[PDB]
Design a protein around this ligand. Structure first.
Ligand code: ADP
Ligand code: ADP
Ligand code: MG
Ligand code: MG
Lengths: 57, 52, 371, 371, 57
């Protein structure tokens, strides 16, 4: 019984290992995506200030 | 964003504390008792009385 | 001093001192009087073997559980079980220890009042408190939200909780549980020739159910596969030899959980009463309940249930929500671990029903502020 | 020191130090007590979540706005909101900062007097001043004339001003505003099957209104188009899935502004109360008011309102006058920007109601010379 | 010996699950931030088109 339980416990441990690795991958991908998002946001902000200036004039 | 994240972090911190630190209250129950052997030493009786 | 976290349950009594990881003594809750005559004189034959002693002499006893469906139907036997639990399995006199019983939701009041009256008059404890069996299972998971499905052996109940505020109008209690699955397995085994009738052989059928049965991911495909190949037939050795071979009875016994029409019950399975319990909640906490579905209780230990239930709920639920099913490996003792955690809290130390309070208001104190 | 430019509003409290461009902290003004029982012990559950915290736990709260129509109906809750605003969203003790509240025109006196009494006794500010919400919105536009239509969330009022001389006999205050539009949208959504009833789901309907609704340039043509094609049906995802599709409810919700007969109100729309407010003015300043019509307030942010209103007024007004509608992109915070500008002026620095003055004349000082 | 092996496997499993859950929380945070970024993009575009119309007129 103990040896079978050891096999299953290692099974579960390895499954959680793999899932955590996949999650880290998705985390870094979303991280680079978020940086790109921030840059797009700043660009839009600058464009907005510019067009406001033009309209006032 | 940091405030919302820290709210959930603090909320789960106390739950983790209660779940985990309280385990340290006792963990020796895994330890089994003696379960000693006889080694052919407890053969010191005849078929005289059996009810008692 | 330390508190006694008892947990009556129905099928296994689990007890132990507050602050540990696992219950100290776990033993079936059966009291069996002998039924034959008895010819040896002076053998020291008792009149009732309780607990784990009656699972070894079960060949000449008539075991009878004192708790049918959560409720207690035979108070003398339950008192005997409690006396055994306190004095022989823990060996601590109750005069010096608070107790924390557990009770299923939506149970009759008289049961709870009689329980507190017994604990205060017969065993004479200093203070006792009764807690709902699902909140503890939520404690043990370390969460504070989530909808917990506590499929015990007596009764399956489904209590949703958000941010610590229980929703009393969304509790769905269903009386299908492990015992009905044992009876149904014992009833479908007769299709191969094996007849178990005696109340002692119900224990053998229970062992078969525990060791062999599993929940199928898809029912029709398994029914088709088991009817063509023979890769499922697992054999099992009775307590006297004569091995038996279980075919498609393996996944048909626990399938009753998701189709209670098998045992003639009208209601919907445990896969749809959870979704109904969620939909009764408010529209803004449904995402959190979807993401934090908790399993507990013994009967949720079938191999492959955490996937079947997730598949079913994902079929029912809207496609955008994420469905996650928390199935900790320590499922069986989840309620008791939560009970230990709750009894070990400092904030909880003033919620006990002190004896002087009971003396002033009678047993009806339990329904009052001290819940 | 610096002045605190608070702006109570009704629906969003906007605050910040004088001299900046945007309010520092903007958060809904709702105070919601929990309504369920609560079973987790030691979770740290408070008795009232205010501000933006109660927009995240709104699933188990009963949110209730403390300001109905400009006037304040629940003084304890308003005091709680102010205390939160000062201490947690700005973290500046009020003992060292002047305050500049804002108040709608034609409001009950007792409301204003109680406001000043609270600010001087409970929070103990050095000096506070109350200003009409439309003059500030005229400050922010950098004008000195013009008729400003400040359609907030509580009450819509229309104050004409010329050369700095306000015309007290031409203020037309109408009580239709964003909240009534939310209720009407929630009432017409039921024509497709979606029922929102709980006070928490009013927030969801408000989000639908903000993100989807728009004001039609011509009402009958849009009603005819939406009834034949399907190019208008925009979908939206609820907080739990189950997307909904809004058809001609999109431009029927904000149309109530120009036809208050939809919600049973007798009065004329915001397109005709402006013309009436102009016609009450003298005959020689009507051209300037026609040319400098100013929009402000949150509810005037509907896409396409600055054209519908101009078309309507051009229909009503004489053909020779030029009708121009000033709709700055920073409409929502226009009142607060104007408040910051006014508080930053040197000429205004001696108009505050100093505390010693209040001690000598009581709360009725606000109606006196220090207006 | 076998019991000790099972215990150690359990320790590994618990620690690794803690790791994986933390990563998942990170992922959810990144998801909400991406949502906000796309929201920014849409509102920027809408306002810019509006000001374009006003400019031309
Ligand atoms: N490993 C297992 N596999 C399948 N079923 C089990 C297993 N262990 C227990 N059960 C079922 O669960 C029941 C015990 O449930 P339990 O959680 O002890 O009930 P209670 O809530 O009364 O304590 C047993 O009767 C048995 O039928
Ligand atoms: N972008 C938007 N589009 C349409 N309606 C909006 C928008 N933003 C806010 N609103 C409406 O305006 C209200 C906020 O108005 P606000 O100016 O904050 O009122 P107050 O004068 O009390 O501050 C909200 O209740 C909402 O109904
Ligand atoms: Mg149980
Ligand atoms: Mg306003």
């Amino acid at each position: 019984e103990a040896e079978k339980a050891a096999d299953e416990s290692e099974r579960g441990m390895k499954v959680i290992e793999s899932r955590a690795q996949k999650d880290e991958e998705k985390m870094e991908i979303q991280e680079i995506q978020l940086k790109e998002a921030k840059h797009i946001a700043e660009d839009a902000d600058r464009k907005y200030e510019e067009v406001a200036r033009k309209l006032v004039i | 964003l940091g405030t919302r994240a820290k709210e959930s972090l603090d909320l789960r911190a106390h739950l983790k504390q209660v779940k985990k630190e309280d385990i340290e209250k006792e963990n020796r129950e895994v330890g089994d008792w003696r379960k000693n052997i006889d080694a052919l030493s407890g053969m010191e009786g005849r078929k005289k009385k059996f009810e008692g | 001093t330390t508190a006694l976290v008892c947990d009556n349950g129905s099928g296994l009594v689990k007890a132990g001192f507050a602050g540990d990881d696992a219950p100290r003594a776990v033993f079936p809750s059966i009291v069996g009087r002998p039924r034959h005559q008895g010819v040896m004189v002076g053998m020291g034959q008792k009149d009732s073997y309780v607990g784990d002693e009656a699972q070894s002499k079960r060949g000449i006893l008539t075991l009878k559980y004192p708790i049918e469906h959560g409720i207690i139907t035979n108070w003398d036997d339950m008192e005997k079980i409690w006396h055994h639990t306190f004095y022989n399995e823990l060996r601590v006199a109750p005069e010096e220890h608070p107790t924390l019983l557990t009770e299923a939701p939506l149970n009759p009041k008289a049961n709870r009042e009689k329980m507190t009256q017994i604990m205060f008059e017969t065993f004479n404890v200093p203070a006792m408190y009764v807690a709902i069996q699902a909140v503890l299972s939520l404690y043990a998971s370390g969460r504070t939200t989530g909808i917990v499905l506590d499929s015990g052996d007596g009764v399956t109940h489904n209590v949703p909780i958000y941010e610590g505020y229980a929703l009393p109008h969304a509790i769905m209690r269903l009386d299908l549980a492990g015992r009905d699955l044992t009876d149904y397995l014992m009833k479908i085994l007769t299709e191969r020739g094996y007849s178990f009738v005696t109340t002692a052989e119900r224990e053998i059928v229970r062992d078969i159910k525990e060791k062999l049965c599993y929940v199928a991911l898809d029912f029709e495909n398994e029914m088709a596969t088991a009817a063509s190949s023979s890769s499922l037939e697992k054999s099992y050795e009775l307590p006297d030899g004569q091995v038996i071979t279980i075919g498609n009875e393996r996944f048909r016994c626990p399938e009753t959980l998701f189709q209670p029409s098998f045992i003639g019950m009208e209601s919907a399975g445990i896969h749809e009463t959870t979704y109904n319990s969620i939909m009764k909640c408010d529209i803004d906490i449904r995402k959190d309940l979807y993401a934090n579905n908790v399993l507990s209780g013994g009967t949720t230990m079938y191999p492959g249930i955490a996937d079947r239930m997730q598949k079913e709920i994902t079929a029912l639920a809207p496609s955008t929500m994420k469905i996650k099913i928390i199935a900790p490996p320590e499922r069986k003792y989840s309620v008791w671990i939560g009970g230990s955690i709750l009894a070990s809290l400092s904030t909880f130390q003033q919620m006990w029903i002190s004896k002087q309070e009971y003396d002033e208001a009678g047993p009806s104190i339990v329904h009052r502020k001290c819940f």
